[PDB]
């Protein structure tokens, strides 16, 4: 009998949120991550990323400012293994081998995953379509790609992606010096998806703003809104479709509102869809292009193509990434 009274609670509106079966995991999970994570950033002790005995400490108390960094990746020794708290000894240990990293990550992904489920489930209790579930799927998938797949493809969570601002940058740099991304279509479409969204989110909102109902209670001293009850909605779509059409050409402009908003959710999502793949594909070593040589068979004199000066920089960095943690000549992972 009780069991029935509980479910009804979870299922409908609670005057704050909606916490369905999906948030039954999402809420306790994302909490453990938050708390742990906030504290790790304010006091975590140094952590030696690559097994080496050279601890890096990117926490507030240990001499950092916000940009300087945060929660550092597990050791390269525990690298790919499961490192819970119970599994170790003293926390002085745990804290050194990157525990916080794993703990925070895994809870976050799981609850991150469920935050997505929750999005759909709310749709089922409100009779609306299931799309928002899909558009979130892009970044989520990406987080996983960066936080999981790679360390899974590489052989150790260490060098997953630090939880600091600064290290984000590091991960990036090291990354293209090791796999050369810039020249990979999936990260190229990525810049397309993003620079896309920028150009469109500006375009739409720009036009939507220019073709407004010029005459609705808007004077030069006041500006007050609309509300669903408002039939004609805010703008004269004929003015916008007319505007844009006259700036380039008829086809160029969009006739109806579906093709407009569908585009807005299509471009970005399918751009990151790919990028998130990009990484996941270079997680197992299928690195970007690399046109290192173009010649003059005349003598075979090598001619440097713009791309070689790209390899000249990619080079300097390879050489010094993870200084003194290499004992053999060629990195293989």
């Amino acid at each position: 009998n009780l069991w029935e009274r509980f479910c009804n609670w979870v299922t409908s509106t609670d005057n704050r949120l909606y916490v369905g079966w999906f948030g039954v995991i999402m809420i306790p999970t994302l909490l453990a991550a938050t708390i742990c994570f906030v504290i790790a950033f304010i006091a975590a002790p140094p952590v030696d990323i690559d097994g080496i005995r050279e601890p890096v400490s990117g926490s507030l108390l240990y001499g950092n400012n916000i940009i300087t960094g945060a929660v550092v990746p597990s050791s390269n020794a525990i690298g790919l293994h499961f490192y819970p708290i119970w599994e170790a000894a003293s926390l002085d240990e745990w804290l050194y081998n990157g525990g916080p990293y794993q703990l925070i990550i895994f809870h976050f992904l799981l609850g991150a995953s469920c935050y997505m489920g929750r999005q759909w489930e709310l749709s089922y209790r409100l009779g609306m379509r299931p799309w928002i579930c899909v558009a979130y799927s892009a970044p989520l998938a990406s987080a996983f790609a960066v936080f999981l797949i790679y360390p899974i493809g590489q052989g150790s969570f260490s060098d997953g992606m630090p939880l600091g601002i600064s290290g984000t940058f590091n991960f990036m740099i090291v990354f293209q010096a090791e796999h050369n991304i810039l020249m990979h279509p999936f990260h190229q479409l990525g810049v397309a998806g993003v620079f896309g969204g920028a150009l469109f989110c500006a375009m739409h909102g720009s036009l939507v703003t220019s073709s407004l109902i010029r005459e609705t209670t808007e004077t030069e001293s006041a500006n007050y809104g609309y509300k669903f009850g408002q039939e004609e909605e805010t703008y004269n779509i004929v003015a916008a479709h007319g505007y844009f059409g006259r700036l380039i050409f008829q086809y160029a402009s969009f006739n109806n509102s579906r093709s407009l908003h569908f585009f807005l959710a299509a471009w970005p999502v399918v751009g990151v869809w790919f990028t998130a793949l990009g990484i996941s594909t270079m997680a197992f070593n299928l690195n970007g292009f690399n046109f290192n040589h173009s010649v003059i068979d005349a003598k075979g004199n090598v001619i440097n193509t713009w791309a070689d000066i790209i390899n000249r920089a990619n080079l300097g960095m390879e050489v010094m990434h993870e200084r003194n943690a290499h004992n053999f000549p060629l990195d293989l992972a």
């Binding site: 704050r16 304010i42 507030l60 108390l61 400012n65 916000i66 509300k227 669903f228 009850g229």
Partner: protein
């Protein structure tokens, strides 16, 4: 102290959350 200041400005950004999400002005159809 370089610290408390990054913390201080932190607690506010969370205090602002609570207050924004739980004490916001109503979105009503009374219109």
């Amino acid at each position: 102290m370089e610290t408390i200041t990054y913390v201080f400005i932190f607690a506010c950004i969370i205090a602002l959350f609570f207050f924004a999400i739980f004490f916001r002005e109503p979105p009503r159809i009374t219109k």
